[PDB]
Design a protein around this ligand. Structure first.
Ligand code: A1CD7
Lengths: 523, 514
């Protein structure tokens, strides 16, 4: 094939693109001793599909009169290789001067001219953090189709970072609203051993205290089935959860971690609970294909509602065919893209097509940049103010208050560079011969539940709540990972409660007696 | 000027001469952020002077780089602001252009090594760039543990122990004096969150319990605060007031504490042990708050003192200037001269490490060096191997990039003409041990050790019953007749006597009975 040649195209304004368009062998994991070129010989289809989405968006924009009339939009794409060094090389090339392979250390950039107008950012949060500082120093507008870490919202450190996938905070807010709706006030929270694994739990624990939910228990779970000591940790976690009298569990972990935990729970039986999933662990094939999943109980989770791109697969097939055509030569950034075969991947992976709405997110990012440029040029339906060349820092002023029409949706960037988005709530009916998912409700900044469609193990809603208030005759004693709720104790006869918020009960004197829950003694 | 010294080989230097916790990270009206707006820092200027003195020493010492002139190119980072342009300037060619290339092995950058920033965020941000070229970066005061990852940071080394050792020193100090019950206060930034989380992790396994962990607002000394922030501070101080834990561990910058302690002063709070982290353990400015001495006992974790001869006398292209630094230093001159040179030694040893590595790289003799075009990756390769004594201490980097300097616990003193920061204990990191705990002047009447525990130890034969979350918190209950409590078998439930034995209302063992 001749396909690596097609990741660059001419135009009046050029978009940069960082994609997971390659990978490196494990031998690269050692400490580098000499600054030689890092090999990235290992193919990645995900990056290919994302780059094709960007190309399709730019082609649509170049054909229509609705955006940027009478001028051509260009691009050139690079592989991040999931490697910070290669990513840094790519970004430094992006900020180099027009027509030159070098970047300037000036003090004043009042007439500097870098070669790209905007950069469509990387697929992972680590590289997003690494590149965002650099890009946002220069006020280069950057748009990420997948970087959900909350830390990226900070406008002080990332003044020019935008994304078209919601932050994790919105998903956890939806979960918290779901917990409030059923008054599932007393909960246990689990996550993976990795950074994301407790970043999620930190955000959830911060959210819970602001709204009442009592995080009774916290912990991390491994994704390493062979690690016997960490399996000891998971056994301890499950015994603790069972001992806590909790009935609802929030589980932010990765798919394999949940698979391990649930398999162990199957074998030693555990007890049924309500498990609340995450975009990471949802529609999980391995988890749903458990031998006897019924021992788990109810399973729920929120999932993003990305719009359709019906023409995408035919576009990919068409362009792979064109890359196979020997005449098309008349028309590396990816070494294996020229080797990879046509049929099986492009068919099967797009039939298997998480991937779909990230493709849509890339498309929407391209459209966001195009609409921002359209506003900045103040284009008419047939005019633009082309007397000047728009510098990147001039887009940034116009990108915060825009709205862009991605396909059928209308979208905006909020004050923190995060898009408005809505979720479906999906629940597992596990009792059919194979488990089935149903859309129990939706979240659009507020939660709507179709109560009539849900199922429960006892045909009645499970409960976990703990008391916070107590009667004037009841002693209060703290419980919870935080001091959020109290289990009331009715003081026994022969003792009295001296005042309604004391934490102990006092015996009566020998000449006196008292009934239960009394505040006083009688002779 | 003080920031520039031409020579055959140039060291890059990044110091926080001016700092504000809230600042412009990005281009300001499309010009590099102006640093001199953000007040001025005594310790940062002191460390810059330490580097300058080190290079002057090396140029005087004919035995270390004979006939080779060593120079420096010093640029002041501004905490997290002004991080990128200094790196671009250091890596660029003589005409301030940096070419992008596939392979950099033959590329001669302006400087051969960077004496990196004092703070963790800047250190990692700079290391991201410098790993591309494998230009060595020696860091003097960043304690974050993530810097030990040599996959992420192949070119980063340190002349100071890691955060783990500081937290270990804290924990062992608390265990020695039997403080089971403590409070942790953290700043609203990465430093406080990370260090507080690390302390929590290490505390969980050692039998110490935390009353609460509380976040301070990011105020500034010369900034008038809102009523909301004033009420926030009042809330924190009131929560301190009503708590039984009289040991407080503070993970905060110095700037954010000025308002805090002032509040604590006007609230009439007294009688606590304040454990300072190295971020403010030896700050002259906070020490000069003369009435602060009424708030209790002030202890801090810091680097060991290594006196540098001649540095005391020595102390008597945008963002390469400071105006107020000299005037500020002259006022604290006496306190600095009476203080031990603690982090200054990290800076000194970093410069000498670069000097020795370059001395080896040039194949230089006692008498002469064959000057050669140095490419920084070879100098990094050499820096990994240096092994020498500078001032009675062996300077070498462990496989994870740290020099194992001793840590010390210090008590603040407000007498004058003797040391502001007295050394009361010494922590050896290669042994993981706290040792030589000397006399401490407590705030108590007869100088008794101040106590903090959730509850008193039970009487003999008396079983524990837990309360709340904390393992440390328990109440004592008598083992009623017929039951006994050998505390080495269990402490929360009594044993039962054999059929031929009985026990009194509370005892460790039974007696024979019909
Ligand atoms: C985010 O961390 C922090 O804000 C704090 C405070 C800080 C902010 C800006 C510049 C320096 C320090 N960092 C630290 O204390 C780091 C550890 C780390 O940063 O991991 N150890 C420095 C110990 C000697 C020191 C040198 C320079 C000083 O002033 C320029 C100073 O006061 C203290």
């Amino acid at each position: 094939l001749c396909l690596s040649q097609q990741f660059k195209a001419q135009g009046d304004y050029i978009l940069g693109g960082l994609f997971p368009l390659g990978s490196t062998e494990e031998a690269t994991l050692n400490q580098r001793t000499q600054p030689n070129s890092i090999p990235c010989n290992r193919f990645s289809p995900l990056g290919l599909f994302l780059a094709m989405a960007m190309k399709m968006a730019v082609e649509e924009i170049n054909n229509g009169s609705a955006l940027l009339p009478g001028l051509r939009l260009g691009y050139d794409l690079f592989d991040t290789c999931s490697e910070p060094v290669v990513t840094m090389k790519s970004s430094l090339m992006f900020l180099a001067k027009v027509g030159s392979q070098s970047i300037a250390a000036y003090c004043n950039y009042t007439q500097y001219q870098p070669r790209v107008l905007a950069v469509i950012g990387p697929h992972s949060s680590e590289l997003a953090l690494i590149t965002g500082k650099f890009f946002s120093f220069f006020l280069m507008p950057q748009v990420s189709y997948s970087a959900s870490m909350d830390r990226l919202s900070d406008r002080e450190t990332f003044p020019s970072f935008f994304r078209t996938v919601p932050s994790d905070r919105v998903q956890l807010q939806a979960v918290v609203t779901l917990l409030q709706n059923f008054s599932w006030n007393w909960v246990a929270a689990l996550g993976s051993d990795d950074d994301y694994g407790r970043e999620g739990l930190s955000i959830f624990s911060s959210l819970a205290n602001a709204r009442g939910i009592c995080i009774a228990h916290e912990g991390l779970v491994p994704q390493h089935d062979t690690s016997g000591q960490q399996l000891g940790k998971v056994l301890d976690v499950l015994r603790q959860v069972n001992q806590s009298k909790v009935q609802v569990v929030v589980l932010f972990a990765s798919a394999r971690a949940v698979y391990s935990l649930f398999s162990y729970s199957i074998h030693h039986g555990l007890s049924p609970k309500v498990w609340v999933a995450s975009e990471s662990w949802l529609t999980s094939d391995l988890v749903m294909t458990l031998p006897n999943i019924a021992r788990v109980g109810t399973v729920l989770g929120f999932l993003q509602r990305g719009a359709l791109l019906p023409e995408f697969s035919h576009y990919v097939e068409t362009h792979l065919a064109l890359a196979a055509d020997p005449a098309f030569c008349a028309s590396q950034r990816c070494p294996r893209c020229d080797d990879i075969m046509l049929q099986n991947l492009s068919s099967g992976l797009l039939q298997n097509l998480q991937l779909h709405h990230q493709i849509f997110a890339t498309y929407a990012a391209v459209y966001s940049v195009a609409q921002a440029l359209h506003n900045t040029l103040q284009c008419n339906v047939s005019h633009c103010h082309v007397s000047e060349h728009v510098l990147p820092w001039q887009l940034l002023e116009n990108m915060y208050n825009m709205s862009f029409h991605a396909r059928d949706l209308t979208l905006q960037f909020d004050a923190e560079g995060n898009v408005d988005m809505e979720y479906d709530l999906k629940m597992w009916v596990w009792q059919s011969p194979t488990p089935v998912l149903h859309t129990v409700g939706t979240f659009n900044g507020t939660l709507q539940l179709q109560q009539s469609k849900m199922y429960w193990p006892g045909n009645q809603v499970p409960v976990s709540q703990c008391s916070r208030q107590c009667k004037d005759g009841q002693v209060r004693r703290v419980k919870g990972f935080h001091s959020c709720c109290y289990d009331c104790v009715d003081c026994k006869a022969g003792s009295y409660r001296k005042h309604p918020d004391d934490f102990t009960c006092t015996p009566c004197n020998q000449d006196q007696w008292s009934p239960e829950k009394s505040t006083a003694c009688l002779p | 000027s003080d920031f520039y010294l031409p020579g055959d080989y140039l060291l890059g230097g990044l110091f926080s001469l001016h700092a504000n916790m809230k600042g412009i990270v990005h281009l300001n009206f499309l010009q590099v952020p102006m640093c001199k707006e953000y007040e001025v820092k005594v310790i940062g200027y002191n460390l810059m002077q330490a580097m300058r003195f080190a290079v002057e020493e090396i140029n005087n010492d004919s035995s270390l780089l004979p006939g080779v002139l060593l120079g420096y190119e010093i640029v002041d980072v501004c905490y997290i602001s002004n991080n990128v342009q200094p790196v671009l300037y250091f890596l660029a060619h003589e005409d301030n252009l940096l070419p992008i290339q596939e392979d950099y092995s033959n590329y001669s950058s302006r400087v051969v090594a960077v004496i990196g920033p004092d703070n963790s965020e800047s250190v990692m941000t700079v290391a991201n760039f410098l790993s591309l070229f494998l230009l060595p970066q020696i860091t003097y005061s960043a304690i974050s543990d993530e810097l030990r990852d040599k996959v992420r940071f192949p070119a980063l080394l340190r002349t100071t122990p890691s955060a783990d050792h500081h937290i270990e020193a804290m924990v062992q100090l608390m265990l020695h004096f039997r403080w089971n019950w403590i409070i942790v206060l953290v700043s609203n930034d990465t430093y406080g969150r990370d260090n507080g989380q690390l302390l929590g992790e290490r505390v969980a396994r050692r039998g110490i319990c935390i009353a609460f962990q509380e976040t301070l607002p990011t105020l500034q000394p010369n900034q008038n605060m809102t009523s909301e922030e004033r009420q926030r501070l009042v809330t924190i101080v009131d929560k301190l007031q009503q708590s039984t834990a009289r040991v407080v561990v503070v993970f905060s910058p110095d700037l954010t504490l000025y308002h805090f302690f002032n509040e604590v002063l006007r609230q009439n709070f007294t009688g606590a042990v304040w454990i300072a982290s190295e971020s403010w353990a030896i700050d002259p400015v906070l020490h000069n708050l003369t009435e602060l001495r009424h708030l209790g006992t002030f202890l801090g974790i810091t680097i060991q003192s290594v006196p540098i001869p001649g540095f005391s006398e020595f102390r008597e292209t945008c963002n390469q200037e400071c105006d107020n630094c000299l005037n500020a230093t002259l006022s604290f001159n006496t306190i600095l001269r009476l203080s031990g040179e603690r982090v200054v030694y990290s800076v000194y040893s970093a410069v000498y490490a670069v000097a020795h590595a370059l001395h080896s790289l040039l194949g230089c003799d006692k008498s002469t060096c064959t000057k050669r075009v140095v490419y920084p990756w070879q100098l990094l390769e050499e820096i990994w191997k240096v092994n020498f004594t500078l001032l009675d201490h062996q300077i070498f980097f462990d496989p994870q990039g740290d020099v194992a300097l001793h840590l010390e616990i210090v008590q603040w003193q407000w007498d004058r003409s003797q040391n502001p920061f007295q050394s009361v204990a010494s922590y050896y990191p290669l042994q993981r041990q706290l040792k030589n705990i000397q006399d401490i002047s407590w705030h108590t009447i007869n100088n008794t050790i101040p106590m903090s525990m959730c509850s008193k130890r039970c009487q003999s034969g008396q079983k524990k019953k837990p309360v709340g979350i904390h393992v440390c918190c328990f109440e004592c209950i008598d083992c009623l007749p017929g039951t006994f409590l050998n505390h080495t078998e269990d402490e929360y439930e009594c044993q039962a006597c054999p059929n031929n034995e009985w026990s009194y209302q509370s005892e460790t063992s039974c007696f024979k009975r019909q």
